[PDB]
Scaffold this active site. Structure first.
Site, mmCIF file in Angstrom:
data_model
loop_
_atom_site.group_PDB
_atom_site.id
_atom_site.type_symbol
_atom_site.label_atom_id
_atom_site.label_comp_id
_atom_site.label_asym_id
_atom_site.label_seq_id
_atom_site.Cartn_x
_atom_site.Cartn_y
_atom_site.Cartn_z
ATOM 1 N N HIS A 82 85.457 58.343 38.097
ATOM 2 C CA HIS A 82 85.532 59.108 39.336
ATOM 3 C C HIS A 82 84.505 58.655 40.366
ATOM 4 O O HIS A 82 84.530 59.147 41.497
ATOM 5 C CB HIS A 82 85.496 60.616 39.083
ATOM 6 N N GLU A 86 64.887 51.285 40.154
ATOM 7 C CA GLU A 86 64.571 52.284 41.165
ATOM 8 C C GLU A 86 63.800 53.461 40.586
ATOM 9 O O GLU A 86 64.072 53.919 39.474
ATOM 10 C CB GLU A 86 65.856 52.832 41.784
ATOM 11 N N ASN A 130 61.921 55.892 43.552
ATOM 12 C CA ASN A 130 62.225 56.482 44.850
ATOM 13 C C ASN A 130 63.299 55.627 45.512
ATOM 14 O O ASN A 130 63.062 54.466 45.850
ATOM 15 C CB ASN A 130 60.977 56.573 45.721
ATOM 16 N N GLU A 136 62.488 46.868 42.287
ATOM 17 C CA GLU A 136 63.929 46.936 42.470
ATOM 18 C C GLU A 136 64.591 45.569 42.323
ATOM 19 O O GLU A 136 64.003 44.523 42.618
ATOM 20 C CB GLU A 136 64.269 47.458 43.867
ATOM 21 N N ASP A 154 87.098 59.297 31.689
ATOM 22 C CA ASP A 154 86.282 59.112 32.891
ATOM 23 C C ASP A 154 85.183 58.088 32.615
ATOM 24 O O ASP A 154 84.019 58.415 32.371
ATOM 25 C CB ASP A 154 85.698 60.445 33.336
ATOM 26 N N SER A 174 73.151 69.004 34.661
ATOM 27 C CA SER A 174 73.353 67.921 35.603
ATOM 28 C C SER A 174 74.138 68.489 36.776
ATOM 29 O O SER A 174 74.659 69.604 36.713
ATOM 30 C CB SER A 174 74.095 66.769 34.934
ATOM 31 N N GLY A 231 78.227 59.782 36.634
ATOM 32 C CA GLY A 231 78.185 58.411 36.187
ATOM 33 C C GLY A 231 76.939 58.042 35.418
ATOM 34 O O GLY A 231 76.912 56.973 34.798
HETATM 35 CA CA LIG Z 1 62.905 52.142 45.632
#
Ligand SMILES: [Ca+2]
Length: 223
Positions: free
Chosen positions: A40, A52, A54, A62, A84, A172, A178
């Site tokens: 989905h 990641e 923030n 990153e 799903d 959640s 996902g």
């Molecule tokens: Ca970041």
């Protein structure tokens, strides 16, 4: 994540953010070149963001890699959310280190009562909207199939499990879709659906990854 805690930067090294100009779903890195998410969450033009914490600040760990192919499960039903699950191939391999790492697939299904870690950048409120910029974490047990089916009559298939708290408060939520449910160091679930967030007698429902290991392995081996 409602009622969770701040994970800490890069403490969940398999967590990815799917970005289409903005964060819209989570996912899990299962090897240097493949991510698993919810069907989905499918859309065109995905950039996968690894390392990641923030999601609004470049902090130095990153890796941004575009997707080259997405494969939604052949039997995904968007009305019931059965099956799903989706695989995303990265255009190039990620560079794996202590802060960016893959999560193992399960060899066996986890039983009710097993404690798992759920993580994501989704909404933190059950009534209202406040989206965090750093990754949030929740520890939650897998619930019995009986309690799950009793909470959602007629809606739970063999490809789903419930996890969380029947008293509510911890769950959640939107934007966590996902993302991973990790138990004993294995990916057992994918954040899929629920009725609102953190409501009494309405725990989160998760895609049961152990049912899909053969499909995942065969698909990765030929794509
Ligand atoms: Ca970041």
């Amino acid at each position: 994540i409602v009622g969770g805690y701040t994970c800490g930067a890069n403490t969940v090294p398999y967590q990815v953010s799917l970005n289409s100009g903005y964060h819209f779903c989570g996912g899990s890195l299962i090897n240097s070149q493949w991510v698993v998410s919810a069907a989905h969450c499918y859309k065109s033009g995905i950039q996968v963001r690894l390392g990641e914490d923030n999601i609004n600040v470049v902090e130095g760990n990153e890796q941004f890699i575009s997707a080259s192919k997405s494969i939604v499960h052949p039997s995904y039903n968007s009305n019931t959310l059965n099956n799903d699950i989706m695989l995303i191939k990265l255009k190039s391999a990620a560079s794996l280190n202590s802060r960016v790492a893959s999560i193992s697939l399960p060899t066996s299904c986890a039983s009710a009562g097993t404690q798992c870690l759920i993580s994501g950048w989704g909404n933190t409120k059950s009534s209202g909207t406040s989206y965090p910029d750093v990754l949030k974490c929740l520890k939650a047990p897998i619930l019995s199939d009986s309690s799950c089916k009793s909470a959602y009559p007629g809606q739970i298939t063999s490809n789903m499990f419930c996890a969380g708290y029947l008293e509510g408060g911890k769950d959640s939520c939107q934007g966590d879709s996902g993302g991973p449910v990790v138990c004993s160091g294995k990916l057992q679930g994918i954040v899929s659906w629920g009725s609102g967030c953190a409501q009494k007698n309405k725990p989160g429902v998760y895609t049961k990854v152990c049912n899909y290991v053969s499909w995942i392995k065969q698909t990765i081996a030929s794509n």
